[PDB]
Design a protein around this ligand. Structure first.
Ligand SMILES: CN(C)Cc1ccccc1-c1ccc(N2CCc3c(C(F)(F)F)nn(-c4cccc(C(N)=O)c4)c3C2=O)cc1
Lengths: 52, 234
């Protein structure tokens, strides 16, 4: 199922390349080394409610 | 917003508000980045000269987080007509960049394919705004938000008195008295996925507000992602 299965374990975007799961992020996010998580590179990354 | 809940501190940081000459809000918009606002094209018919206020939550109090932004460039979709209300989208380039802070942050723009199979296949979405709380009431002084369920394309095309094109989607309740309303136009319809909110729609139109067997008609953002990319390279 790849992406059809729990978003392929990706935090955000997910696509099946070479019949495998490939994750990616929105701008302002960098993919983690596990290649699944997305790391915000700033204080106010997009799509995040501001709770301070 | 009719029904729904008031937006609490920092819950809807991507909400923008189009204000006319009397500093009155007439429409909404979504923050896409420090320089770009996404709104509806028909709103660019609702006011002569207007600005964009961000960080506002209570239009009555001088909270301190508000920031007014003048529009440098207005990019309305060329295929828009009030005749059909199709292609109800527009991007606004700001003269000065928005400084993100509490209650001020952009929403994520997703990828077309992923958003269509993963976000719009979800149960609900969230619409927010300072629009009317009642179909005959006045604009709200408090920003509101409402979780509205996605309506399957056929049940909605049948419920509508107007042609529901592929550029639009339905969201709301058949009976339940919760729905967006006038004043909310151009505002954000976002879909949350693992704590991150993505812009999925643009408040567009509806036959009244919260009526039985009627739903909200939103501009489908996935249908204009490339148009939006082109527009932000201004
Ligand atoms: C021939 N032309 C002019 C038309 C047309 C042509 C083609 C296809 C469709 C249409 C069309 C365009 C606009 C409307 N109207 C008028 C009434 C109205 C009201 C109120 F309060 F006045 F009742 N609120 N509100 C509104 C605003 C934003 C969101 C929603 C929602 N409920 O999610 C509702 C509308 C609204 O959109 C209905 C139909």
């Amino acid at each position: 199922k790849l992406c059809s299965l729990d978003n392929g374990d990706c935090d955000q975007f997910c696509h099946e390349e070479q019949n495998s799961v490939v994750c990616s992020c929105a701008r302002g996010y960098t993919l983690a080394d596990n290649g699944k998580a997305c790391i915000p590179t700033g204080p106010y990354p997009c799509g995040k409610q501001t709770l301070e | 917003i009719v029904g729904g809940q008031e937006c609490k501190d920092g819950e809807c940081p991507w909400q923008a508000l189009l204000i006319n000459e009397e500093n009155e809000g007439f429409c909404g918009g979504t923050i896409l980045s420090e320089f770009y606002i996404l709104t509806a094209a028909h709103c660019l018919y609702q006011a002569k000269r207007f600005k964009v206020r961000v960080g506002d939550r209570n239009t009555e109090q001088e909270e301190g987080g508000e920031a007014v932004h003048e529009v440098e460039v207005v990019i309305k979709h060329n295929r828009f007509t009030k005749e059909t209300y199709d292609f109800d989208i527009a991007v606004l380039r700001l003269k000065t960049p928005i400084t993100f802070r509490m209650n001020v942050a952009p929403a994520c723009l997703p990828e077309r394919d992923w958003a269509e199979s993963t976000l719009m296949t979800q149960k609900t979405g969230i619409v927010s705004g300072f629009g009317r709380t009642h179909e005959k009431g006045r604009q709200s002084t408090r920003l509101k938000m409402l979780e509205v369920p996605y309506v399957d394309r056929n049940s909605c095309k049948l419920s509508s008195s107007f042609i529901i094109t592929q550029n639009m989607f339905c969201a709301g309740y058949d009976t339940k008295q919760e729905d967006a309303c006038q004043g909310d136009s151009g505002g954000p319809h976002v879909t949350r996925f693992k704590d991150t909110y993505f812009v999925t729609g643009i408040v567009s139109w509806g036959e009244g507000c919260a009526r039985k067997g009627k739903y909200g008609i939103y501009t489908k953002v996935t249908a204009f992602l490339k148009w939006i990319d082109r527009s932000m390279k201004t």
